[PDB]
């Protein structure tokens, strides 16, 4: 059965699926429910459905997501982060502003507070755009079969990097360590940072009778054979 509470969630050996209606009060009206559909090995299928209208149209209202459960590692010691995400997204006609995105966080300790954030937008709808100090991409980088414009800006004391795919991706397959290593080699992301959070879901701004169905999601963090503390 679905769960619609602001902070509802369901735990699995490898994933936690959150409803996470953390900014629901910025909308004038609406609600959102999330549910888990299957769990086969390290692959999970889940979905979320919502309506959010009015209020602060520019603000993320929620971020239902599947979050990986994993041993935290410093980026310098991560060999690979293989991930897959296949989804569909429907809604009713009219205003629809949202994104499908991975959300990763790093800290200086495995248990520390967020210091850097790395988003990967597989889809941006109705003009949704990431945090950007300048309002302009700082780079265009191709990873695997997809091209991404890179944005950068603050969120409090957090530095937020957002890769935005140049074409919508509905069937994603990538090694996210390539994204982190691009940032450590080119954008000043410290390789001593611990990867502490890896999730994938959707950020709605405005939408009616919307439903994202994640037909399959998986992620894993793999460490190098030689660890340097």
Curated annotation (Swiss-Prot):
Enzyme category, top tier: hydrolase
EC number: 3.2.1.151
GO cellular component, one term: host cellular component
The reaction(s) this protein catalyses: xyloglucan + H2O = xyloglucan oligosaccharides
Chief site of localization: secreted
Record InterPro entries: ConA-like_dom_sf, GH11/12, GH12
Description of the deletion phenotype: Severely reduces virulence.
Keyword terms: Carbohydrate metabolism, Glycoprotein, Glycosidase, Hydrolase, Polysaccharide degradation, Secreted, Signal, Virulence
Record's subcellular location: Secreted; Host
GO molecular function terms noted in the UniProt entry: cellulase activity; xyloglucan-specific endo-beta-1,4-glucanase activity
Pfam families recorded: Glyco_hydro_12
Active site: 117, 203
Coiled coil keyword on record: no
Family to which this protein belongs: Belongs to the glycosyl hydrolase 12 (cellulase H) family.
The name this protein goes by in its record: Xyloglucan-specific endo-beta-1,4-glucanase 1
Source organism: Phytophthora sojae (strain P6497) (Soybean stem and root rot agent)
């Amino acid at each position: 059965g679905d769960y619609c509470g602001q902070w509802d969630w369901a735990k699995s050996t490898n994933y936690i699926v959150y409803n996470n209606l953390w900014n629901k009060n910025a909308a004038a009206s609406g609600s959102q429910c999330t549910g888990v559909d299957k769990i086969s090995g390290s692959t999970i299928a889940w979905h979320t459905s919502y309506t959010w209208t009015g209020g602060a149209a520019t603000e993320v209202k929620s971020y239902s997501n599947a979050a990986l459960v994993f041993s935290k590692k410093q980026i310098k010691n991560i060999k690979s982060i293989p991930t897959k995400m296949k989804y569909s997204y429907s809604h009713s006609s009219g205003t629809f502003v949202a994104d499908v995105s991975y959300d990763l966080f790093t800290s200086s300790t495995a248990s520390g507070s967020n210091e850097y954030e790395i988003m990967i937008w597989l889809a941006a709808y109705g003009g949704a755009g990431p945090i950007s100090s300048t309002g302009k991409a700082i780079a265009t980088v191709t990873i695997g079969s997809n091209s991404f414009k890179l944005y950068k800006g603050p969120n409090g004391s957090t530095t937020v990097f957002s890769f935005v795919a140049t074409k919508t991706i509905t069937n994603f397959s990538a090694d996210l360590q390539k994204f982190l290593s691009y940032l450590t080699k080119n954008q000043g992301l410290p390789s001593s940072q611990y990867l502490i959070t890896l999730e994938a879901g959707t950020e709605p701004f405005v939408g009616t009778n919307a439903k994202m169905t994640v037909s399959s999601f998986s992620a894993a963090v793999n460490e190098q054979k030689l660890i340097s503390e």
